[PDB]
Amino acid sequence: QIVLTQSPAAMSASPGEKVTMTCSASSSVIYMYWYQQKPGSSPRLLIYDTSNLASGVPVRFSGSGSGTSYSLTISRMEAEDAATYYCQQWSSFPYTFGGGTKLEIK
Amino acid sequence: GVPTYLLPGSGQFLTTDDHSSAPALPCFNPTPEMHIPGQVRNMLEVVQVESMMEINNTESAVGMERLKVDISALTDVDQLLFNIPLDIQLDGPLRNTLVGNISRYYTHWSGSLEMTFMFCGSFMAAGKLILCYTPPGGSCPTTRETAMLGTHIVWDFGLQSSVTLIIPWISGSHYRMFNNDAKSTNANVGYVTCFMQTNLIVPSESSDTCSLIGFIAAKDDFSLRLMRDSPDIGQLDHLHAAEAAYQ
Amino acid sequence: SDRVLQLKLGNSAIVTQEAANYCCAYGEWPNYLPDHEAVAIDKPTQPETATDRFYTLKSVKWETGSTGWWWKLPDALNNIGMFGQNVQHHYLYRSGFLIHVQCNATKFHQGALLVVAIPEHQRGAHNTNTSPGFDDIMKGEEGGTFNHPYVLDDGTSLACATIFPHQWINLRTNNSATIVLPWMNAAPMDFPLRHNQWTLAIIPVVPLGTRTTSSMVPITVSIAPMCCEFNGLRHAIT
Amino acid sequence: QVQLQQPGTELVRPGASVKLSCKASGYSFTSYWMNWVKQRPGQGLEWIGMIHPSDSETRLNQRFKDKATLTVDKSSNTAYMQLSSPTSEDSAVYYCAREGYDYDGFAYWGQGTLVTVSA
Amino acid sequence: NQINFYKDSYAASASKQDFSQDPSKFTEPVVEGLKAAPVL
Amino acid sequence: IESIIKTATDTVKSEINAELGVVPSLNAVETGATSNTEPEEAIQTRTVINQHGVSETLVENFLSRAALVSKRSFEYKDHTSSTARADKNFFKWTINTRSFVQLRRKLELFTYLRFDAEITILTTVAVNGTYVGLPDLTLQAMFVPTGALTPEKQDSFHWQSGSNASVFFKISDPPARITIPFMCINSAYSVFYDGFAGFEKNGLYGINPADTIGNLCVRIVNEHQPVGFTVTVRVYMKPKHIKAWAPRPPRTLPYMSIANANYKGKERAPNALSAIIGNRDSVKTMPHNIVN
């Protein structure tokens, strides 16, 4: 059971600012996945294999990282983007998820 | 200095070339050797180990049902059980054997082969079998009186469970080729048919359906030549996680 | 002459009246680590008769729909006896194994077992890219079950499994199969908990069946370590 | 095109048998897996396990494997989820999700159901 | 023929000259050797 | 018994023999030993002098060939525009034998291997879309052990390589070839590793350090040209000085990932999960049977 540490647990950002998150793993995984869950909606896949963007995902989203450290990058923040964020590992069973990241627009 | 001149084939990269090259790590000392069991110096050591033929390859057979041949009691004398195509380098039953996989890396092959069948029926089961080998040029014999004209052995169930059928090396040439025509005179090895000598008799308490397990190995006169790539494996795409090694 | 066999090592002994010429893997017999192959300087401990003896595992039922059973070593033995204590207190170990499998049936039963010891068996997973987990691979004493024994779960062929040290249990010919495994590894010693050098498999090549009244047929495995050594004495990690 | 239809809130009892289905459309029901994830209020997601409808092969998380069993139906194209001994910890939001057509990680999700445990 | 002017011994060309075989370990991994004779 | 066998064995002539108590054709597979029945004992043979050589099946001759371990293409241009996911004129590859299945399945026929890695880098340049010409570029390949600090930029000061071994070569020059020794901390490599590397239970299954050669960092030393090119680097590895132990079964089903042994199987035979060999009508049916 690889424990994924999602840091920071919370952040605040203005529209247009760059936000950056870090998903730390208790071991070395291969690819990192990322999710968005709206306030009361179902999750959605955004970055898979730490490179590509899924459907309906703007180019503003990005991801990178290797080894045990993986990160998500959003170039320009928008007010509609406030939601929880998760990181998943495909490498070993069971599938483990990040702690979650909550953020609002000030 | 020394006057020289280049030859055709200078600067080329040949995958099979044998040459010495610049060591990347100077004065490196590899780890001392430790004795490990089961060293294979020559690949002909592997092909001499008997491995299970898959005779039952057919529909309505899933998974492990394909490695055994069901034998049952019969109401008619002189019946055929199964037949084995003998081409190693085609897709036939011999494909997945040790002798079959190592031989599909090579274009030419030579030497005698052996089949071995182990009767797995109950201790109270009796029977006699005949294992026939027909050299090429004819059609697969469907009758025993036509099949017993070739190399065969008659086998009676007992304490020893296994009979060995030598397939001798019979050819006009020193080798045979893999080439994808199965009927070529340089390829086809002939046929193997198995008939009921007498019958399979079992008591009412024992199970009436008994099974055989085909094995095949290679003798110490076996040989292989002209290595090639193996068709048994191939990829149309990059494997998973292969891109991650570039991260 | 090769039919009856007795194995006396330790305070335990096993007799069998039907056996075929017990298999000695790769012609190698277990022995202690010689002085020229020894990496660790500390004086190793050799419990001898304490850790070298047959440890019987839990019997498994054999039923027609059985897909086969596997046990990984030393992992199966790490919780058992004084061998299981030396594993927990000691950083390193080196030993060979002696496998004996007991399956019996009436002369009216038919069946066959391929009993094979797969060196360095790396298991796969069906129709997924995810590597197997820690609890999937490490079953302890209970042992696991083949999902697809036809491919040996690693994607290889069961037909070629005879290249590994093996015997058969053919309910007609013999009631037991014995395999003697030396130390297999690239390193002279090894960490007991994470790495498993051998995987013992019992595969139903030919299924069970009879027309006699149905009964339970157990499959029992008695595993005896041989020439054990241990290094890195510390507190028990367990 | 694909639509995973999941039921709504279901009140349960302390030790009854929870019956949860999942619906599939727009794709071959036997060609992919089915994955179940739980959500506690203000908590992170956890992965219960999977089942493959073809041969009815399931693979579960080491922890929930004993407390949950999965069932599939190829005819009605409806995957089932059953829980045992509902308690205060079993109240959560359950999603049934599946792998992407070439992508990994649950690109298609469900609508979720809210399990309310009361005694 | 071989030519190696490099100092390190692992830089040398591949050595194909080892013909030693021991098929008896794979083919005959038994404690009692078989007779060319019923074994059982 | 170990012996020097340079050729296939000779055949001796045998006569008609019927004798009680001697049954050369009977064996016991339950012993696990291969049938020792000789052709002389089964049927009646003639004296043959077999001159066929065994030299081409030697594990040294068998396993040692140049096979493609890696192939990697990247753009050569000014990267001040393109994002970070694209290559910035350098790329780092962790050296593994599991990327391509021809060499992978062939090295997985054995449990342990001890060999020297002879590496060859072959580079091919093209022009992105009017044609101009193929420039002559100098490429650096620096050998970085696993876990060390690899360059983050083309122009980074990590490429000075005062310690790490590097090699320089040109497109026009013959392919660069270096010999990597046997660096495993053990006596041989583990092709299959049953266990975990780390003491914690979160480790990876089958992923073993000390079986990784290291990282190979390749860049284009020349500064970016006014026109974007496309460079493709192919690396070939030839084992040599080979010792092999404990042969294994050849893998049937196709590979899925390089990180593990996970199998899938094709949709139908051959090489299907349930059927490895293609299906025929019945056990009595001969597909290629001759008809005249």
Residue numbers in the entry:
A (entry chain F): 1 to 106
B (entry chain C): 1 to 247
C (entry chain B): 10 to 247
D (entry chain E): 1 to 119
E (entry chain D): 27 to 62, 64 to 67
F (entry chain A): 1 to 129, 134 to 296
How did the manuscript describe this experimental structure?
Enterovirus D68 (EV-D68) is a small non-enveloped virus belonging to the D species of the Enterovirus genus within the Picornaviridae family. The main structural features of EV-D68 capsid include star-shaped mesa at the five-fold axis, narrow depression (the canyon) around each mesa, VP1 hydrophobic pocket directly beneath the canyon floor, and prominent three-bladed propeller at the three-fold axis. Binding of cellular receptors or treatment with acid trigger a series of conformational changes in the virus, resulting in two expanded uncoating intermediates called the expanded 1 (E1) and A (altered; 135S) particle. Here, we show the discovery and structural characterization of a two-MAb cocktail for delayed treatment of EV-D68 infections.
Importantly, our high-resolution cryo-EM structures revealed a previously undescribed neutralization antigenic site on EV-D68 capsid. The Fabs bind to the tips of the three-bladed propeller-like protrusion of EV-D68 and face each other across the icosahedral two-fold axis. Note that VP1 BC loop resides at the north rim of the canyon, while VP1 GH loop and VP2 EF loop are situated at the south rim. The purified c2H12 and c8F12 were >94% purity as determined by size exclusion chromatography. Both c2H12 and c8F12 had high affinities to the 18947 virion with KD values below 14 nM. The results from neutralization assays showed that both c2H12 and c8F12 potently neutralized the EV-D68 strain 18947 with IC50s being less than 180 ng/mL. Taken together, these data indicate that the chimeric antibodies c2H12 and c8F12 retain high binding affinities and neutralizing activities.
